[PDB]
Amino acid sequence: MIRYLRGLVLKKEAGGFVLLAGGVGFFLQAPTPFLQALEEGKEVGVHTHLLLKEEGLSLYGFPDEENLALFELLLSVSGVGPKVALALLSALPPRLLARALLEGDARLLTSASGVGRRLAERIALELKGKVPPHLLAGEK
Amino acid sequence: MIRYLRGLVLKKEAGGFVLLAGGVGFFLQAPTPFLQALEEGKEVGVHTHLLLKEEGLSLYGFPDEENLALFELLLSVSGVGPKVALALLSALPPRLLARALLEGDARLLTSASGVGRRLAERIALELKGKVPPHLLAGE
Amino acid sequence: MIRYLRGLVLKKEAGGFVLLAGGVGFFLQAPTPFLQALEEGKEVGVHTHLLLKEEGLSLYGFPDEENLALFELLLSVSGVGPKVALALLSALPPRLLARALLEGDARLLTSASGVGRRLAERIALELKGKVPPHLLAGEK
Amino acid sequence: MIRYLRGLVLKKEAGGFVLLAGGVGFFLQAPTPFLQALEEGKEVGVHTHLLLKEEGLSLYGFPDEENLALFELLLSVSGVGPKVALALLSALPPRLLARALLEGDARLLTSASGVGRRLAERIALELKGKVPPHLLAGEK
DNA sequence: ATAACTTCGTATAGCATACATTATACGAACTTAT
DNA sequence: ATAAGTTCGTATAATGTATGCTATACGAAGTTAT
DNA sequence: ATAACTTCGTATAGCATACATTATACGAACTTAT
DNA sequence: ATAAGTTCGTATAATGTATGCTATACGAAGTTAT
């Protein structure tokens, strides 16, 4: 339904984050690691998904560029509840998406501050070595 | 999903009002003293939460950068009408700033009226400990 | 939530029309005497009321100049838009409600054709008689 | 509710594409001949019915000149299994309207393929006066 | 005892689509002037 | 008795909806000769 | 003559509670001044 | 010896089987010179 909304924001919350278009303001919670950066700007480039029933409407969050690969890999739709799907994903340590990734897939669902999800062979092949180019740093 | 609309109002209704914006015409139900102080000459910073119940699909309003999360007090099984669905303020004690809502935990809002319920263990925990710069004024 | 739509309209259909407010196009079904003459000419001040149904969702775009009292009077919790408040104006097409009301509020809403709507419409005496409106003609 | 969307498109995907000119980014799934190498105009205009449910969170699109009658004629039972209906399954083969459904208003939907049952009496009334002479080649 | 206050109590709200489209151009029988 | 209105209760047409079978790479029959 | 040349179509598992599994911050366990 | 002290063990996020029904005009009590 919704992908890659841009909005506007100048605010950060410990468990929250919002997007403004000027007249309406969207609320989107992004994965915990990268919220320490990527706060101020005219665009945050967030992918979305949402629940439709029983008073639970709230857009989800994911990093800039394109990272729905993360959501597809870590959906866990089998009755996990909204308390997890919004934020508790990074089983990987991507700190800049170009510094710790592509290191022989050891930092690609192999060994990190996670639980050992025991899944691979899909994102790694799809990666096609696009990690290095022009991502050596982040953004404010 | 939606939070912190903005704009200016031109109409006043006993049940609520509407917000002037591009596209659709946004409908907003807000507490009674808030709407009286929020005329066309005051900017309408509604911090909606969109409490939806079938036909009751409408936004809501609150004083700008204040009094938000009244849902923590007004959580209920089913809101029969707007008069319980966040169109309050006729009742709870403080007015014109919600300054007496905490008052440094000196007075609690539960026993000031017969419509509230005993929630002393939850009223105290609020940003009041940070001593916000809100003080008596025309706000 | 939505009350006062504004946007672009250029089409006339036997079941209704469409409204373009940029980005999306809203589908609106005006009452029978309204759309039969008033279709296009500017960003029309067509009002709004949403509906819930199992086999159809749309808008109902009531006439301009604050005529939503019509839907408010004719709506029931068990009613359906295509069959209620939109099919209750045939055999009674007042060309202009301001003309039919000015100094004739009681007459038009009391002694007109029909024997069913009056029981509820008796409230509508005071709704429109506020100020002299600029409804001397239509639009095309 | 929503009909005749329009916005910014720059991406081609095997399932569909996105539309994010203003506010959210709408996900659009065009039919097979359109999706087969019709992409990236200035702005694209697509119809829909907004058949959005809990499991399926996508909305569909169709050629930029009318053709919601195509969805009306293509309406199929949307089962649990994917790749059914979803704006796909275009029985007609045409490269474009004027290219391969001209020469009368019956040839467009007579003896096309498969079943081969004529259904002109329902559809021939709409595009007969607008298909020629434009729309001879695809838009890049 | 009662007029004119002041003060305390009380102070909104009707309807079942118990499968989801209340219908536009014909025949029968009149009625007049054919 | 029928030519020509007139009226009304006759009365639309197949519409179009609501928890689970589709894409793909393999055998193979038959080609052509004797 | 055997071998060498057209056509050629089809082999992803889990649906049946939708409410118990996970970031942190106290603590026993270490070195050395009898 | 040993207390303190190093580094790994500890610990929190729903009510769906569910939905129909508290609501601001004026009724009633009390004092004085009517």
Author numbering:
A (entry chain C), C (entry chain A), D (entry chain D): 1 to 140
B (entry chain B): 1 to 139
Sentences from the paper on this structure:
To understand the mechanisms of RuvB recruitment to the HJ DNA by RuvA, we reconstituted the complex of RuvA-RuvB-HJ DNA for structural analysis. To our surprise, we only obtained a structure of RuvA-HJ DNA. Perhaps, the entire complex readily dissociated during grid preparation. Cryo-EM structure of the RuvA-HJ DNA complex revealed that RuvA assembles as a tetramer to recognize the crossover of HJ DNA through charge-charge interactions, which is consistent with previous biochemical and structural analysis. A crystal structure of RuvA in complex with HJ has revealed that RuvA forms a unique tetrameric architecture, in which domains I and II are responsible for Holliday junction binding. Lastly, RuvB is loaded onto HJ DNA by interacting with RuvA, which assembles as a tetramer to bind to the HJ core.
